[PDB]
Amino acid sequence: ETILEVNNLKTNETTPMQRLCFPVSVQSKTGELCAAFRADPGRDGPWQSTILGQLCRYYTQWSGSLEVTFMFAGSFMATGKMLIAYTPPGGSVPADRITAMLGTHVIWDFGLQSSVTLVVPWISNTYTTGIITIWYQTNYVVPIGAPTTAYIVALAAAQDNFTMKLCKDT
Amino acid sequence: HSTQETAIGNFFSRAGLVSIITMPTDGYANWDIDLMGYAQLRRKCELFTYMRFDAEFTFVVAKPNGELVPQLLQYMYVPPGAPKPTSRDSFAWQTATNPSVFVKMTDPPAQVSVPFMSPASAYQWFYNMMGTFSIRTVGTKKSPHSITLRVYMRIKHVRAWIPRPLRNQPYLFKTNPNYKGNDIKCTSTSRDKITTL
Amino acid sequence: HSTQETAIGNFFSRAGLVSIITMPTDGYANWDIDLMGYAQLRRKCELFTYMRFDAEFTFVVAKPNGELVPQLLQYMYVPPGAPKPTSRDSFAWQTATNPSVFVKMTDPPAQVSVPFMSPASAYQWFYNMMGTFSIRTVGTKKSPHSITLRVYMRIKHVRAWIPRPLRNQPYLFKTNPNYKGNDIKCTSTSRDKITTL
Amino acid sequence: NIVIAYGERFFTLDTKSWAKDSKGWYWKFPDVLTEVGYRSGFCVHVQCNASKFHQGALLVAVLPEYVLGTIQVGAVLTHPYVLDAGIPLSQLTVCPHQWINLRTNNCATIIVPYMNTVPFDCNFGLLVIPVVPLDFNAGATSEIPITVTIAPMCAE
Amino acid sequence: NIVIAYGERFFTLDTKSWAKDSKGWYWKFPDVLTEVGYRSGFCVHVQCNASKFHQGALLVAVLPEYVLGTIQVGAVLTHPYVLDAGIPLSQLTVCPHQWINLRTNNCATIIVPYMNTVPFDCNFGLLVIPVVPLDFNAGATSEIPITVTIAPMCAE
Amino acid sequence: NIVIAYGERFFTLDTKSWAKDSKGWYWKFPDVLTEVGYRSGFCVHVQCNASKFHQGALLVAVLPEYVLGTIQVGAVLTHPYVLDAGIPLSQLTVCPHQWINLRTNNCATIIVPYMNTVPFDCNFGLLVIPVVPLDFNAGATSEIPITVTIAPMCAE
């Protein structure tokens, strides 16, 4: 499990240390979107920073299952709920929290746990895009003294059925 | 399917060009054997720390434009710890301890295998001298033909240890892994917002 | 007699010409591998729907008039999904992942076998990209010899599925099975009356 | 939560102050014990003492043959995104590593055996990088100490 | 703490914001699942996420044949003392109920079976009433989310 | 008279009118059931209702990967001698086919299994071609209906 770069904005090019974590806050409302990213290791994007997306550049075709592990780095006295939705390939991006709950999703509350693992069923490359959206289920509540913002670090690794062939020099 | 294509032996197959030597009308060249000679085969070898293998060379020799002439050549391999030839008619060309081959230009190219020549148990890129080659034309007179050749190198019996993060910055020197401090380019590509899929 | 001559393996034997390449005095060619290049081997391959086989190539190279010259050539095979060479001295000619051969013109021709390179289980003509070849002369100077060559292709280990009616109309394009709508020629020959034997 | 590298007394160093704008520290082994108090093993222990109102995350990871590049206390990293060696921070988890997240646990220990081409002979390093920065409110303690405890094993 | 009514997938609705002057919310069953994603059962789950510095108490209770009177998101109660139906709030514990007190526990689930005069055919409601109001100091989170999770059982 | 292709509920489409100058109809599978009411099989049933005073013959035949060429209801063939694809009508019996001759029998059904290079993924077509034209006398019914009944089997 190596670290991704989900927060690849235009203003983070000068300070590249902020590209490893995306922030949550109190002022964000409920039922809104926090982050969204593709699930392709070959093409450019958030998967260029992992070792899975750097060794698949030496090949052409790959097929198998992946997993994405999130990690919370907030205060101990804070609690809340997040929604980690996954759309099937060929579908559309959800517009709100309601239609994203009907698909494949997991409710992750960081008041009890600290890491959630979302497993992608199958990807292939001969669109096939596996968009994972981060939704705000409940708002971020903190007591007095606790910090208002926190950060989530996303990791990514492959399963035991991820094969590749057709070696190609970059 | 099976997992044979992603093995460590097939990842270092399909021998490519490692050197190019042009000898126009001095008469001798000295090419040191080094893996980090191009952008390729340096990022692929820096994925690990300890490597153990043998070498396999091929000397495809021709004229600068296609054709071949009946000329006799000599490819002398200098062992690690032996003096290099400093002239065309030096005493190092007749040294019996330095093995050499004698092929022509109208000959299929030579196939020379160089074994594991390190005093340790494996090679080390982060802290070897595998050898040097010397190429000259035989005879005591200047041959009136421009000679050029390219060397292809295969890597057999690959064994790797201690995987390492891959280099994403361009190289500046070939002795140390240096980078430029005026800018740090991002590994990933950027977008306008984190919500735009 | 036995029924060995009408087998599916012997029906696709006896390799014929699939391409002709003329390189006069650019220096490099790019020939895409395609079975439907002539009138032959297209009506015979459209008898079925799913085919599974491997390839076998031979590069007979000469001058435009008979004779041979001592010239060194290179036949580089580009895998499906790799960038093609766009120039004579491009970076694609030194790519290690693209396999190449180095033969001369005074050499018996090369024998290259290309395996089943499709992501599916069989090829499909009715709804593949098996590969492309790149041929150039070595060296940094223009060779003063006009070079021409022809490629012969064999088909081994033939397996066929879903037989199809044979095409009796002439082809217009090479992507879709189109015909001309102004006239429909008859498959059979006509006679004056149905009673005249 | 004992992690062993690749599946095969107690010296206490100084305490580093995790500030709000800290970048990282690294120690060279076995140079860190050459003035206080060859083939050996190692058993390092990295632990920090923070309250339940501080947030942050550290990434402790050993790195064999960690060489640097030109632009006991340990030096301070200048560019922690490329680790002053060209390799990225996000791919550092291919080494034997451990996460020190201030929400749950406050300890991290790595078992490192001997690793060299020659059996008898600086072998490895130890990077502690604040991936998630320290955040707190006004009035709390501005510095959090990080103590490193090293224990040698089977020295020859 | 499983309570069953009278001794005999997982849909997630929207999150309601428990404000300082909230009065109550009610949902009509089975109307709340008629646009997302007859004889059946029900297994509802009411849980909220609050810190250890907030105080308050909720009263979740089902009510079969809850009809209203004239003066998916659910409506907001106007007069929570008479529940807009003439019946008092203090006698609502004769129904299968549960107390959500923020000092100890943060979950509440009620098992509701089928209940009608005809076996095949809005059956019941679900009132969440803030009996004890939410109180906090300045600087804390002003809203506390309340999530309702409904699970149907043995649908015919 | 069950024919199986290569030796290995009930949806009813519209009825086509077999006229005196009809040329043929074709349906694309599985596109014909994508608006009414992947790996599957198929069991199609083609039957027509005609009297004992009408004469004619139909040729129902499936065709895998039937692509067309440029010159639920199904389209009408323009040139039925070349089937708008260059292949002749007389060699169509190499496919799994059935003859609907109005003298003897009025039903035709073909069992078609799954057939593709990839097991999980328009697969095949279905041509109904009036080889022998319909003939009758004055006063009889000018149109004969042709009903297609499709039954899917073992869908995955």
Side-chain angles (χ1 to χ4, degrees), chain B residues 25-48:
Chain B
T25 43
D26 201 339
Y28 84 110
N30 292 144
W31 167 72
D32 305 77
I33 306 175
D34 51 334
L35 270 52
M36 324 320 167
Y38 281 83
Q40 271 312 317
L41 196 45
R42 190 183 146 86
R43 196 190 187 266
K44 210 146 63 182
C45 273
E46 278 175 359
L47 180 53
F48 312 99

PDB file of all heavy atoms in Angstrom, chain B residues 25-48:
ATOM      1  N   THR B  25      38.939   7.609 -40.143  1.00  0.00           N
ATOM      2  CA  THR B  25      40.291   7.499 -40.678  1.00  0.00           C
ATOM      3  C   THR B  25      41.239   8.475 -39.987  1.00  0.00           C
ATOM      4  O   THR B  25      42.455   8.292 -40.007  1.00  0.00           O
ATOM      5  CB  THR B  25      40.318   7.760 -42.192  1.00  0.00           C
ATOM      6  OG1 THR B  25      39.488   8.885 -42.503  1.00  0.00           O
ATOM      7  CG2 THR B  25      39.818   6.540 -42.950  1.00  0.00           C
ATOM      8  N   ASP B  26      43.088   7.725 -34.930  1.00  0.00           N
ATOM      9  CA  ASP B  26      43.978   7.087 -33.971  1.00  0.00           C
ATOM     10  C   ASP B  26      44.106   5.605 -34.320  1.00  0.00           C
ATOM     11  O   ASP B  26      45.210   5.076 -34.429  1.00  0.00           O
ATOM     12  CB  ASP B  26      43.450   7.269 -32.542  1.00  0.00           C
ATOM     13  CG  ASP B  26      44.532   7.095 -31.481  1.00  0.00           C
ATOM     14  OD1 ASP B  26      45.573   6.464 -31.761  1.00  0.00           O
ATOM     15  OD2 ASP B  26      44.336   7.599 -30.356  1.00  0.00           O
ATOM     16  N   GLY B  27      42.967   4.941 -34.494  1.00  0.00           N
ATOM     17  CA  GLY B  27      42.933   3.541 -34.852  1.00  0.00           C
ATOM     18  C   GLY B  27      42.500   2.589 -33.758  1.00  0.00           C
ATOM     19  O   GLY B  27      42.294   1.403 -34.042  1.00  0.00           O
ATOM     20  N   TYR B  28      42.357   3.058 -32.522  1.00  0.00           N
ATOM     21  CA  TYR B  28      41.939   2.210 -31.418  1.00  0.00           C
ATOM     22  C   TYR B  28      41.009   2.996 -30.504  1.00  0.00           C
ATOM     23  O   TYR B  28      41.131   4.216 -30.364  1.00  0.00           O
ATOM     24  CB  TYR B  28      43.144   1.674 -30.631  1.00  0.00           C
ATOM     25  CG  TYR B  28      43.678   2.621 -29.579  1.00  0.00           C
ATOM     26  CD1 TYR B  28      43.513   2.351 -28.225  1.00  0.00           C
ATOM     27  CD2 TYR B  28      44.350   3.783 -29.939  1.00  0.00           C
ATOM     28  CE1 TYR B  28      43.998   3.215 -27.259  1.00  0.00           C
ATOM     29  CE2 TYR B  28      44.840   4.652 -28.982  1.00  0.00           C
ATOM     30  CZ  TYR B  28      44.661   4.362 -27.644  1.00  0.00           C
ATOM     31  OH  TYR B  28      45.147   5.223 -26.687  1.00  0.00           O
ATOM     32  N   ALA B  29      40.058   2.284 -29.902  1.00  0.00           N
ATOM     33  CA  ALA B  29      39.122   2.866 -28.949  1.00  0.00           C
ATOM     34  C   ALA B  29      39.196   2.084 -27.645  1.00  0.00           C
ATOM     35  O   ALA B  29      39.636   0.930 -27.608  1.00  0.00           O
ATOM     36  CB  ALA B  29      37.705   2.868 -29.506  1.00  0.00           C
ATOM     37  N   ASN B  30      38.791   2.741 -26.560  1.00  0.00           N
ATOM     38  CA  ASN B  30      38.685   2.121 -25.243  1.00  0.00           C
ATOM     39  C   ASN B  30      37.315   2.463 -24.675  1.00  0.00           C
ATOM     40  O   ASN B  30      37.076   3.604 -24.264  1.00  0.00           O
ATOM     41  CB  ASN B  30      39.797   2.601 -24.313  1.00  0.00           C
ATOM     42  CG  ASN B  30      41.163   2.113 -24.742  1.00  0.00           C
ATOM     43  OD1 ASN B  30      42.157   2.826 -24.609  1.00  0.00           O
ATOM     44  ND2 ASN B  30      41.220   0.892 -25.256  1.00  0.00           N
ATOM     45  N   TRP B  31      36.418   1.483 -24.652  1.00  0.00           N
ATOM     46  CA  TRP B  31      35.063   1.667 -24.144  1.00  0.00           C
ATOM     47  C   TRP B  31      34.932   0.927 -22.819  1.00  0.00           C
ATOM     48  O   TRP B  31      35.088  -0.297 -22.767  1.00  0.00           O
ATOM     49  CB  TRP B  31      34.023   1.173 -25.147  1.00  0.00           C
ATOM     50  CG  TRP B  31      32.657   1.066 -24.552  1.00  0.00           C
ATOM     51  CD1 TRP B  31      31.830   2.095 -24.211  1.00  0.00           C
ATOM     52  CD2 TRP B  31      31.957  -0.138 -24.217  1.00  0.00           C
ATOM     53  NE1 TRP B  31      30.659   1.609 -23.685  1.00  0.00           N
ATOM     54  CE2 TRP B  31      30.711   0.240 -23.680  1.00  0.00           C
ATOM     55  CE3 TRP B  31      32.261  -1.498 -24.323  1.00  0.00           C
ATOM     56  CZ2 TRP B  31      29.771  -0.692 -23.249  1.00  0.00           C
ATOM     57  CZ3 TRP B  31      31.327  -2.422 -23.894  1.00  0.00           C
ATOM     58  CH2 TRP B  31      30.097  -2.015 -23.363  1.00  0.00           C
ATOM     59  N   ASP B  32      34.641   1.668 -21.756  1.00  0.00           N
ATOM     60  CA  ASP B  32      34.401   1.078 -20.450  1.00  0.00           C
ATOM     61  C   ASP B  32      32.995   0.499 -20.394  1.00  0.00           C
ATOM     62  O   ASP B  32      32.033   1.099 -20.881  1.00  0.00           O
ATOM     63  CB  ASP B  32      34.577   2.117 -19.343  1.00  0.00           C
ATOM     64  CG  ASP B  32      35.932   2.795 -19.391  1.00  0.00           C
ATOM     65  OD1 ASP B  32      36.121   3.682 -20.250  1.00  0.00           O
ATOM     66  OD2 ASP B  32      36.808   2.439 -18.575  1.00  0.00           O
ATOM     67  N   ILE B  33      32.879  -0.684 -19.791  1.00  0.00           N
ATOM     68  CA  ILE B  33      31.582  -1.338 -19.686  1.00  0.00           C
ATOM     69  C   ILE B  33      30.801  -0.709 -18.541  1.00  0.00           C
ATOM     70  O   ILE B  33      31.227  -0.748 -17.382  1.00  0.00           O
ATOM     71  CB  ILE B  33      31.737  -2.849 -19.484  1.00  0.00           C
ATOM     72  CG1 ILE B  33      32.619  -3.447 -20.580  1.00  0.00           C
ATOM     73  CG2 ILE B  33      30.377  -3.520 -19.475  1.00  0.00           C
ATOM     74  CD1 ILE B  33      32.926  -4.914 -20.377  1.00  0.00           C
ATOM     75  N   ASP B  34      29.648  -0.125 -18.863  1.00  0.00           N
ATOM     76  CA  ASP B  34      28.789   0.477 -17.857  1.00  0.00           C
ATOM     77  C   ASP B  34      27.339   0.274 -18.267  1.00  0.00           C
ATOM     78  O   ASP B  34      26.992   0.424 -19.441  1.00  0.00           O
ATOM     79  CB  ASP B  34      29.093   1.970 -17.678  1.00  0.00           C
ATOM     80  CG  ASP B  34      29.113   2.723 -18.993  1.00  0.00           C
ATOM     81  OD1 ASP B  34      29.378   2.094 -20.037  1.00  0.00           O
ATOM     82  OD2 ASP B  34      28.866   3.946 -18.978  1.00  0.00           O
ATOM     83  N   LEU B  35      26.500  -0.075 -17.293  1.00  0.00           N
ATOM     84  CA  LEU B  35      25.078  -0.254 -17.560  1.00  0.00           C
ATOM     85  C   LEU B  35      24.360   1.080 -17.691  1.00  0.00           C
ATOM     86  O   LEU B  35      23.507   1.243 -18.569  1.00  0.00           O
ATOM     87  CB  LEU B  35      24.412  -1.078 -16.452  1.00  0.00           C
ATOM     88  CG  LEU B  35      24.332  -2.609 -16.525  1.00  0.00           C
ATOM     89  CD1 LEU B  35      25.682  -3.263 -16.787  1.00  0.00           C
ATOM     90  CD2 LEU B  35      23.686  -3.176 -15.273  1.00  0.00           C
ATOM     91  N   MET B  36      24.696   2.041 -16.831  1.00  0.00           N
ATOM     92  CA  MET B  36      24.070   3.364 -16.847  1.00  0.00           C
ATOM     93  C   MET B  36      24.746   4.224 -17.916  1.00  0.00           C
ATOM     94  O   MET B  36      25.558   5.110 -17.640  1.00  0.00           O
ATOM     95  CB  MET B  36      24.157   4.004 -15.470  1.00  0.00           C
ATOM     96  CG  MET B  36      24.002   3.018 -14.322  1.00  0.00           C
ATOM     97  SD  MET B  36      22.728   1.784 -14.643  1.00  0.00           S
ATOM     98  CE  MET B  36      23.078   0.593 -13.355  1.00  0.00           C
ATOM     99  N   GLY B  37      24.397   3.937 -19.167  1.00  0.00           N
ATOM    100  CA  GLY B  37      24.928   4.669 -20.301  1.00  0.00           C
ATOM    101  C   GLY B  37      23.849   5.443 -21.030  1.00  0.00           C
ATOM    102  O   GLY B  37      24.133   6.402 -21.753  1.00  0.00           O
ATOM    103  N   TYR B  38      22.602   5.030 -20.837  1.00  0.00           N
ATOM    104  CA  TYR B  38      21.454   5.684 -21.436  1.00  0.00           C
ATOM    105  C   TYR B  38      20.398   5.939 -20.370  1.00  0.00           C
ATOM    106  O   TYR B  38      20.579   5.585 -19.199  1.00  0.00           O
ATOM    107  CB  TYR B  38      20.861   4.840 -22.571  1.00  0.00           C
ATOM    108  CG  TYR B  38      21.637   4.934 -23.865  1.00  0.00           C
ATOM    109  CD1 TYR B  38      22.766   4.150 -24.078  1.00  0.00           C
ATOM    110  CD2 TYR B  38      21.246   5.811 -24.867  1.00  0.00           C
ATOM    111  CE1 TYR B  38      23.482   4.235 -25.258  1.00  0.00           C
ATOM    112  CE2 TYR B  38      21.955   5.904 -26.052  1.00  0.00           C
ATOM    113  CZ  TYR B  38      23.070   5.113 -26.241  1.00  0.00           C
ATOM    114  OH  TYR B  38      23.780   5.201 -27.416  1.00  0.00           O
ATOM    115  N   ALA B  39      19.299   6.572 -20.784  1.00  0.00           N
ATOM    116  CA  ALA B  39      18.187   6.801 -19.868  1.00  0.00           C
ATOM    117  C   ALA B  39      17.496   5.492 -19.513  1.00  0.00           C
ATOM    118  O   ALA B  39      17.095   5.286 -18.362  1.00  0.00           O
ATOM    119  CB  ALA B  39      17.195   7.788 -20.481  1.00  0.00           C
ATOM    120  N   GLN B  40      17.371   4.604 -20.493  1.00  0.00           N
ATOM    121  CA  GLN B  40      16.928   3.241 -20.233  1.00  0.00           C
ATOM    122  C   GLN B  40      17.962   2.488 -19.401  1.00  0.00           C
ATOM    123  O   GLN B  40      19.091   2.952 -19.231  1.00  0.00           O
ATOM    124  CB  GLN B  40      16.667   2.500 -21.546  1.00  0.00           C
ATOM    125  CG  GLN B  40      15.251   2.656 -22.075  1.00  0.00           C
ATOM    126  CD  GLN B  40      14.201   2.420 -21.007  1.00  0.00           C
ATOM    127  OE1 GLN B  40      14.307   1.488 -20.210  1.00  0.00           O
ATOM    128  NE2 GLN B  40      13.178   3.267 -20.986  1.00  0.00           N
ATOM    129  N   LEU B  41      17.563   1.330 -18.885  1.00  0.00           N
ATOM    130  CA  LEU B  41      18.467   0.441 -18.156  1.00  0.00           C
ATOM    131  C   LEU B  41      19.232   1.152 -17.039  1.00  0.00           C
ATOM    132  O   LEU B  41      20.283   0.684 -16.605  1.00  0.00           O
ATOM    133  CB  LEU B  41      19.445  -0.244 -19.116  1.00  0.00           C
ATOM    134  CG  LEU B  41      20.194  -1.460 -18.565  1.00  0.00           C
ATOM    135  CD1 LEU B  41      19.247  -2.380 -17.810  1.00  0.00           C
ATOM    136  CD2 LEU B  41      20.899  -2.210 -19.683  1.00  0.00           C
ATOM    137  N   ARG B  42      18.700   2.280 -16.578  1.00  0.00           N
ATOM    138  CA  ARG B  42      19.192   2.909 -15.359  1.00  0.00           C
ATOM    139  C   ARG B  42      18.055   3.104 -14.366  1.00  0.00           C
ATOM    140  O   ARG B  42      18.220   2.865 -13.166  1.00  0.00           O
ATOM    141  CB  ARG B  42      19.859   4.245 -15.684  1.00  0.00           C
ATOM    142  CG  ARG B  42      20.617   4.851 -14.513  1.00  0.00           C
ATOM    143  CD  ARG B  42      21.193   6.214 -14.865  1.00  0.00           C
ATOM    144  NE  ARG B  42      21.198   7.122 -13.719  1.00  0.00           N
ATOM    145  CZ  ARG B  42      22.169   7.176 -12.814  1.00  0.00           C
ATOM    146  NH1 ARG B  42      23.222   6.377 -12.917  1.00  0.00           N
ATOM    147  NH2 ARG B  42      22.092   8.035 -11.807  1.00  0.00           N
ATOM    148  N   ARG B  43      16.894   3.544 -14.856  1.00  0.00           N
ATOM    149  CA  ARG B  43      15.702   3.579 -14.020  1.00  0.00           C
ATOM    150  C   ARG B  43      15.211   2.175 -13.703  1.00  0.00           C
ATOM    151  O   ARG B  43      14.642   1.940 -12.632  1.00  0.00           O
ATOM    152  CB  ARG B  43      14.603   4.387 -14.713  1.00  0.00           C
ATOM    153  CG  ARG B  43      13.463   4.815 -13.807  1.00  0.00           C
ATOM    154  CD  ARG B  43      12.313   5.381 -14.619  1.00  0.00           C
ATOM    155  NE  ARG B  43      11.269   5.953 -13.775  1.00  0.00           N
ATOM    156  CZ  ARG B  43      10.191   5.289 -13.368  1.00  0.00           C
ATOM    157  NH1 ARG B  43      10.014   4.028 -13.731  1.00  0.00           N
ATOM    158  NH2 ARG B  43       9.291   5.889 -12.602  1.00  0.00           N
ATOM    159  N   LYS B  44      15.434   1.231 -14.615  1.00  0.00           N
ATOM    160  CA  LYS B  44      15.050  -0.156 -14.402  1.00  0.00           C
ATOM    161  C   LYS B  44      15.998  -0.887 -13.463  1.00  0.00           C
ATOM    162  O   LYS B  44      15.577  -1.827 -12.779  1.00  0.00           O
ATOM    163  CB  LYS B  44      14.984  -0.888 -15.746  1.00  0.00           C
ATOM    164  CG  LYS B  44      13.982  -2.024 -15.795  1.00  0.00           C
ATOM    165  CD  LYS B  44      13.358  -2.141 -17.175  1.00  0.00           C
ATOM    166  CE  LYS B  44      14.399  -2.479 -18.229  1.00  0.00           C
ATOM    167  NZ  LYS B  44      13.803  -2.549 -19.592  1.00  0.00           N
ATOM    168  N   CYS B  45      17.268  -0.481 -13.414  1.00  0.00           N
ATOM    169  CA  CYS B  45      18.228  -1.111 -12.518  1.00  0.00           C
ATOM    170  C   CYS B  45      18.251  -0.471 -11.139  1.00  0.00           C
ATOM    171  O   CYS B  45      18.764  -1.085 -10.197  1.00  0.00           O
ATOM    172  CB  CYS B  45      19.631  -1.064 -13.129  1.00  0.00           C
ATOM    173  SG  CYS B  45      20.013  -2.444 -14.228  1.00  0.00           S
ATOM    174  N   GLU B  46      17.716   0.738 -10.996  1.00  0.00           N
ATOM    175  CA  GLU B  46      17.638   1.402  -9.705  1.00  0.00           C
ATOM    176  C   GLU B  46      16.369   1.050  -8.940  1.00  0.00           C
ATOM    177  O   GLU B  46      16.117   1.627  -7.880  1.00  0.00           O
ATOM    178  CB  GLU B  46      17.742   2.919  -9.879  1.00  0.00           C
ATOM    179  CG  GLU B  46      19.168   3.420 -10.019  1.00  0.00           C
ATOM    180  CD  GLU B  46      19.245   4.906 -10.307  1.00  0.00           C
ATOM    181  OE1 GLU B  46      18.178   5.547 -10.416  1.00  0.00           O
ATOM    182  OE2 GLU B  46      20.371   5.431 -10.427  1.00  0.00           O
ATOM    183  N   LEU B  47      15.566   0.118  -9.461  1.00  0.00           N
ATOM    184  CA  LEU B  47      14.414  -0.375  -8.718  1.00  0.00           C
ATOM    185  C   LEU B  47      14.846  -1.237  -7.540  1.00  0.00           C
ATOM    186  O   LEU B  47      14.149  -1.292  -6.522  1.00  0.00           O
ATOM    187  CB  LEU B  47      13.491  -1.153  -9.657  1.00  0.00           C
ATOM    188  CG  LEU B  47      12.202  -1.785  -9.128  1.00  0.00           C
ATOM    189  CD1 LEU B  47      11.353  -0.757  -8.397  1.00  0.00           C
ATOM    190  CD2 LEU B  47      11.415  -2.422 -10.261  1.00  0.00           C
ATOM    191  N   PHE B  48      15.997  -1.892  -7.647  1.00  0.00           N
ATOM    192  CA  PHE B  48      16.550  -2.727  -6.594  1.00  0.00           C
ATOM    193  C   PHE B  48      17.885  -2.155  -6.127  1.00  0.00           C
ATOM    194  O   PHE B  48      18.357  -1.125  -6.620  1.00  0.00           O
ATOM    195  CB  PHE B  48      16.701  -4.168  -7.082  1.00  0.00           C
ATOM    196  CG  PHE B  48      15.479  -4.707  -7.765  1.00  0.00           C
ATOM    197  CD1 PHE B  48      15.396  -4.740  -9.149  1.00  0.00           C
ATOM    198  CD2 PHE B  48      14.408  -5.178  -7.021  1.00  0.00           C
ATOM    199  CE1 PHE B  48      14.270  -5.233  -9.778  1.00  0.00           C
ATOM    200  CE2 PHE B  48      13.280  -5.676  -7.643  1.00  0.00           C
ATOM    201  CZ  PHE B  48      13.212  -5.701  -9.024  1.00  0.00           C
TER     202      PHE B  48
END
